[PDB]
Every structure is written in C-alpha cells, then in structure tokens.
Design a protein around this ligand. Sequence first.
Ligand SMILES: Nc1ncnc2c1ncn2[C@H]1C[C@H](O)[C@@H](COP(=O)(O)NP(=O)(O)OP(=O)(O)O)O1
Ligand SMILES: [Mg+2]
Ligand SMILES: [Mg+2]
Length: 430
Amino acid sequence: GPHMATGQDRVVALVDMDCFFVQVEQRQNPHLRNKPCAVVQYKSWKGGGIIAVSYEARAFGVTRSMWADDAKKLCPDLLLAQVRESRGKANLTKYREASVEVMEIMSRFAVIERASIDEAYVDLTSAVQERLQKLQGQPISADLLPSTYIEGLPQGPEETVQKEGMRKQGLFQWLDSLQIDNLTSPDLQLTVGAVIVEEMRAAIERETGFQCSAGISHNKVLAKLACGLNKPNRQTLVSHGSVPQLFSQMPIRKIRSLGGKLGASVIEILGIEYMGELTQFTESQLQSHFGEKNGSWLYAMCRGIEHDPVKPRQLPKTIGCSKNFPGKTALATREQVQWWLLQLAQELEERLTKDRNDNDRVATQLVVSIRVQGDKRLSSLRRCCALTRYDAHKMSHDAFTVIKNCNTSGTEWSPPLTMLFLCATKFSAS
DNA sequence: ATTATGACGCT
DNA sequence: AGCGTCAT
Ligand SMILES: Nc1ncnc2c1ncn2[C@H]1C[C@H](O)[C@@H](COP(=O)(O)NP(=O)(O)OP(=O)(O)O)O1
Ligand SMILES: [Mg+2]
Ligand SMILES: [Mg+2]
C-alpha cells in the first residue's frame, strides 16, 4: 500500500491547436474568421480534399478526408482555403512556420516534446515546484483558471443547465477541496500546472492570435486524452482520482497507441470494450496475449499510470517530401519518375538548407520510398544512400540510382508507382 | 482517388 | 538495413 506507485510523480500537459490549419488561414484572411471554413488541397478532383475544418463547419457534419464538393452538400456556405502548391505538390511551409511560432512560445515556459505540427507535450514538474515555492500558502483563486475543466466534477447536488455553469461549479468543488497546505499533494501540483498552462495558452493566443486546448495530468497519455475532452479553446485537468470513472465507459480505441490493430486485438481477445475493464487481468495475462512491453504498459495504463518521459526535442528528427499518384495518374515512364524525384528533391533541398542555417545541423542519409500500384502499404520499398551534398540534382539522381532496378520492363516503368517519398535523416551537428 | 509526412518498434 | 504500426 505504502509501496504501490500511483503514477503521480510528474505534471505533464499536452497543448494542441484548435482547427490549426484553418486558424492559420483565418489569421491571414479576416474574411474567413468565425465562419464555417475548411482547408483543402488539390481543387481539381472533387473540389479538393479537406485536411482541416473549423468548428462552425463541424456543426454541419463536415470532416477531414471529405471531398470539398461533398462538404458543400452538407454546408452550402462553407468557405475554403487552398494549400499552397509548388512544383506540382502541396507545400505546407505556411503551417510549419506557424507551428514554429507556437513551439517557441511554449519552450519559454518548460521543456517540450514536439509531437506533431500542432501539439507538444510539456513537462511542468519543475515549474510547478518553483511556483509552489513562490507563493507560500497562497490559496488558488478560480480567476486563475478561467478556461479550466475538472474532469469528473461537479458531482452531487440551476446554473448547471448551461456549460459554463457546469464548468464553474466543478472548479469550485475542486478548489474548495484543495488543501494549499502540503506542497506535495499531487492534486495541488496538477492545479498549479493548470495555472501555468492557462498562462501559456494566454501567451500563445496573445502572441500569435491562435487559440488552443490543453490537457493537464500526470503523464502523456492522460494529458493527451484530457486535451480532447473540452475542445475548443478550453483546458481540462485529469486527476489520478478521476481515472476509474473516466475509464469505466472509455472505449479502448480512444487511448493513444490503441487506435489500431493492438487495440482491436485487446477488444477481440479479452472480450471487453472499455479501458477500465483491463484492471481485472493480471500483468502476466496481459503480457501473454500482447507481449512483454505491451502487457506491462496496458497493466499500468488502465490504472492511469504511464512512465514515458517527455523528451527534450523541439526539432524534427527527419525532413521529408512525398507525393501520391492515385489511380490512372500512377507513374508509368522512366522520365516521369525522374522528373517527380527532381521536384521532391528541390523542395527537400530548400527545407534542408534552411534547417542547416536555423539549427546548426546537417542530414547525412537519404531514404527513398516508393509505393507500387496495387499495394495497400504506405511503402512498398525503402532504399537509402549517403546524403553528402544539399544538391537537388545529386539527390534526385542518387534516389533514382537506388530504386531504378525496381523497374520490371520498358523507357517504360512498371509496375507503375503510386507514391514517391524522399526523407532526409541521421542529422549531425554542423 | 483518404494526402503529406512524422516517430519509432521489430527483426 | 528494411519493414510494420500508429499517429496528426
Ligand atoms: N490525416 C491528416 N492528413 C493531413 N493533414 C492532417 C491530418 N490530420 C491533421 N492534419 C493537419 C491539419 C490540421 O489542422 C493539423 C492538426 O491536426 P489535429 O490536431 O488533429 N486537428 P485540428 O488541429 O485541425 O483540429 P482540432 O485539434 O481542434 O481538433 O494537421
Ligand atoms: Mg489540433
Ligand atoms: Mg493535433
């Protein structure tokens, strides 16, 4: 009892931007603000593919992966913004630069781990300790947490007919219970972490004009889950004590890393649907079905416990460019293949050169991946070679050299390629 | 014809 | 080294 770890050692948050690519386009074009809007790529086929959707547009049922022509059927007044196109492919530079704006603000507060173009984990354990020392015995006011939800509250016994009324009542219950006394209560630490995350979210909105949501908990999985509970423009605190009720009706697929085959297996092999049901199995039983690492992870995670560290990494480990060639457009000639490789290499060269100037590093390996027609896998084949010069002509020529014997017969290229992907990796200081 | 592209585990 | 999974 006295010796059972409860996974309450850290304070971790996950900050994720709300409808991020849309906000980027709305900041730039004020006519799009506060309107049902989506961002699309490649307008020629079915009006383009939607990759981001404003919350006003979601209310009509518009979603990612939907065709714009189809989205317009659900939402006639839907406004659209097109992703920039360069060299015949989508160019996501505008969103990467916007991402940098936000990541640089978050880094001021604590160590972060970039997790995607629009989210990062934050390890607030040290910052909370410092803040706790800064205010001795200072009780925490509700005004310090104007956009925070406490998951699981309010509980027990009219302002609650509306959502802000629920939020405030739950926050009051939580704050009324908190003992400022006792610098080591995990609940107190989370609360101070939440205050700091309000400050962080305020700074991002002030300095970039972008709104975001956040989750604060004791580990990355719970912080990520918490982030999505009250999006948009709100933050949610998930305490250790909230986990049994929260996990009791939480579908297994909603937990990070369980959204694929492993999660399906868990459900299928154990005959359960919710994360909390995992507690009735022993660690050995879970290890026997899903392996040593997965079994141990599951046994601790269904109890709200996870030890994956927030890595101190702001910069991407790899830099890559890819393009799909669906259906009839699959590449069928040598020349075609070489031209598209050159286009990808030119974009890559730009991004690498910038990376070298900004971050004092150079990539040393080039990985080329291709997908052949009829193959469902992301990558049909991967090959690599040395990246010794940031030269687009050398890179595209070397990439062709490494995959040219994949061609069964021809001038002609077969089987046709439905994807080309160039990735620069193995960075070293410069 | 659900795209562009990341991190990282397994062998 | 090369492939498979899970992810936004
Ligand atoms: N499958 C995909 N393919 C291409 N781009 C994608 C993508 N999923 C996301 N993006 C791009 C476009 C997105 O804007 C961005 C962030 O991904 P989220 O955080 O998953 N989604 P958002 O921020 O939009 O809304 P909110 O978080 O409020 O739910 O990455
Ligand atoms: Mg987001
Ligand atoms: Mg995200």
